[model samples]
Target: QATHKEFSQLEKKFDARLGVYAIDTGTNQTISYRSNERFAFASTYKALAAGVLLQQNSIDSLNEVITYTKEDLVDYSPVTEKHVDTGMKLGEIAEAAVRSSDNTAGNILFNKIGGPKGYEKALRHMGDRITMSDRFETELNEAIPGDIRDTSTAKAIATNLKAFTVGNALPAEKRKILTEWMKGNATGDKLIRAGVPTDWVVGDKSGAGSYGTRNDIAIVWPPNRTPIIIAILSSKDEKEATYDNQLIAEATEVIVKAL
Candidate 1:
């Protein structure tokens, strides 16, 4: 069945809006379903941070210090709460920021990149837009407009990832490092990655937000198939994580098989 046709069925089944984009990088084939729509992307926001950070610094910069204080701590993401005082290096912290979806690690790097004003200026220089504002802990609460906000678009990120992987925004080594980190992200086992066969490899990042905002971005390398870029954002009243994940998994299967 056509991928979009499958997406239609999935949407009807779940009775929710599902934003999707999938591209076959090698064959120049692509598909989209409300891919340009925006929402609170939560932690997938870090992938953008990784590119910006790498552009302004060196891989060696990962060795730089990220001293964690009590103020930097956030809940349900324990990397910093345990590593407090001594702190962790940029490399380790960045890895958790994307790979483990740690809010503390992401905020530290986000701060180093100049926070809201800093990221806005730099991204404009690179032909991107303002998407991040306050720390991970702060924005999830729907903080002040004069305060902070974080947002992302499914298509824009897919575009950014394609560019970061091959463009001058990041050097070859840095690009590889970023994708490698994505490939090994400890979360999202049952999201997009879980939608495919066990043998195929997937490099991905995921975000979990309140009020049923579940999102993921991924590069899937199915055996003997061209790599597919898939981004899906689901906002629903579905309260069960397993049910939400199954929706993601089902969506993935539709596209993977279509390709």
Candidate 2:
């Protein structure tokens, strides 16, 4: 089994702070490593936004279209930029935000959910107190160390994700759609997904930011065993530091195997 010693070693090896939390569905056993500490939310919050949006509107409402002009665009808007001339459906925007971390789609989603205030209010209604968002899109990704503008703890996110996707927070149908988007997430290949076995079913959302901040939150289903929800949040001390995807993957592999 992995120990705090190993987690500390990883931190030294990668020159980054690593926060991780994992819980087994059946046994309710958990493993934590600096999991209570804060880290920038980055694109990881997009997943939570998707969940909040699902709760605020009916399933059918997703088919509604939202029109926006070029002024609404932001950096890293790979999906939404293409459709600027022609508005995209709400469901499509949500998928792009969650699956590909599309900045424009996420900002539009935040607007639809009433921006940061409304999003935090809904999270509070659902009993989450640790996650906070004050900015939108590329701005939030400015994950400078010691700057707590938009942040969340590993434990809080892991618990919140479980409540949204595996708990009764959202109806089963809505949960299915959210999970399907996460399972097919295009941005998680180098994070948690790289650590788990190929046969296991994994659903995840990943984020990248300044100061080497990189995060992945996921739900993994081991063959014949209960599912496990894990959140790994990381960042280096240097503002110009580069992300260490291998470090995140190794951390995941260690935690999942031990838990």
Candidate 3:
């Protein structure tokens, strides 16, 4: 069961709507705050796509020569739409898509891994009930069809993370590669990393949109204890979103300290 007293304290301090869950791998203790509710995934779905690709083929052997054209550059995605002719291998693109949240890089990988059809197949293979749609790294502001809207519950996100972490869904080598990519993520200022020390190893991904939705999921490696998974989803004003992210981080810190 969850502690409402602790969660209420966080809800009062954060201005945005927040959902969080923590699971201690060692003790099997679980704490959740709106963990099952669905939220928009934004760029976080790219990591899933990356994992799927690596599962299907060796990260080193999956060579793809991707060229970014001006037309492929869509605004509002993390990757800037600059007209540059450069060759990138599949492994390089996967790293960029997961680590830098590069839209064009994800687009290239998505196309290679069979696009939406393939992504859905991968998710079903994982036995994930959470729905994930839409192509990777698409323009956030562009009108998305109802069938293609990328949305997922925090439970599904955590479940996928757990599968990747434990080598249950993807192959061991591919899972290792995916975990390495997450650890290399460039943006670390929000949610999962904010409350932890700089030396702590936090493997995570974040997603946000113009609609004021923000979400983060991570496996936090705490000192002297088993790693814990923390996932948060939020939606509200932009300022509220930031505050909520920070609050979730703070709350996670408190929970870890209690452990």
Candidate 4:
């Protein structure tokens, strides 16, 4: 009954394909609809990178300095341009990569955590069906193939967030740090939070790339209510992406209120 309610609400507002899974730990009831299909990850992949670092217990030492070479500057990343010779620590770079969506910082962290191998390990551990391809550029280059970019599913995103929250997948301290950094993440313009009460604390990550695609995955903590996680991935119709995101937020609000 609750699943139907949630689905109906989503249908009312969301125009693009959507998948959602909401759990009330207090009640042990789950409302899941189309939660497993894959979609492009956009910048949300950074969270996976963050998880790998945390799993390695490398958070505190993340502030250690690592020099950036020209090859690392291939993406349109703020870290590549701003922190080049600044001698900042690994922790600082991680923070910048997560909170600011800095591509250079992401690549730097990506390399430190073992690059493709490390990321694949994290994905396998999570049992995610999505794949991280080799075509992603350190710089935001138009030359990269569209399909080679990183992609994920709503279910996978929710699962990872659940792991991050419960501390079962990584060290407690590192998980805590990663959760804090996620809360501070800067890309929230497209979904989840766009329609919620501003007073509520929303921890989220978003990614956008290659025309008509937007991905938003978030955990919303409303006052006196159990936390809700929403993941939305949209493709086609660039003009309506923002509106679609707002639709998800509004629909989620309806579901929460019904609970």
Error of 2 at 166 (Å): 0.4
Please identify model 2 stretches exceeding 4 Å from their true place: none
| lDDT (C-alpha, whole model) for all candidates | 0.73, 0.89, 0.69, 0.64
In model 2, the worst 10-residue window by lDDT is 141-150
Candidate 1 off by > 4 Å: 129-135, 141-149, 224-226, 237-243
The residue pairs that clash in candidate 3, if any, are none
Model 2, range 1-259, lDDT digits (tens) per residue? 2568889999999988999999997899999999989999898888889999999899989999898889989888889999998899999999999988899999989999999877888888888888788998788888877677789899989998998889988999999999999996658988999989888888999988988899999988899998899999999888888988999899988887787
Candidates sorted on lDDT, descending: 2, 1, 3, 4
- As a whole number from 0 to 100, the lDDT of residue 57 in candidate 3 is 78
Candidate 3 residue-wise lDDT, 101-140, digit = tens: 7777777777877886677778878898676666555554
The candidate maximizing TM-score is: 2
Model 1, 1-259: lDDT tens per residue?
A: 2567788889788766677878888887777777766656667767768877888888887898778678658765567677886878888887888788888777876787887567656666766663444444546534222332565567766766676665567889998988888986558798988898899898888877754667888888878876777787776544432226677888888777777
lDDT (Cα, tens digit) per residue for candidate 4, span 1-259: 4566656555555555555666554564555666665556667777767777777755557667778766567556775576566656778777777777777777777787777667766767777656553434432222122454465567677777667655377878887777677785557754566666777777777766544456666667778867766666555434334434565666466546654
Could you tell me which 10 consecutive residues in candidate 4 have the lowest summed lDDT? 137-146
Best by lDDT: 2
Better of 1 and 3 by lDDT: 1
Model with the higher lDDT, candidate 1 or 2: 2
Count of clashes, each model: 0, 0, 0, 12
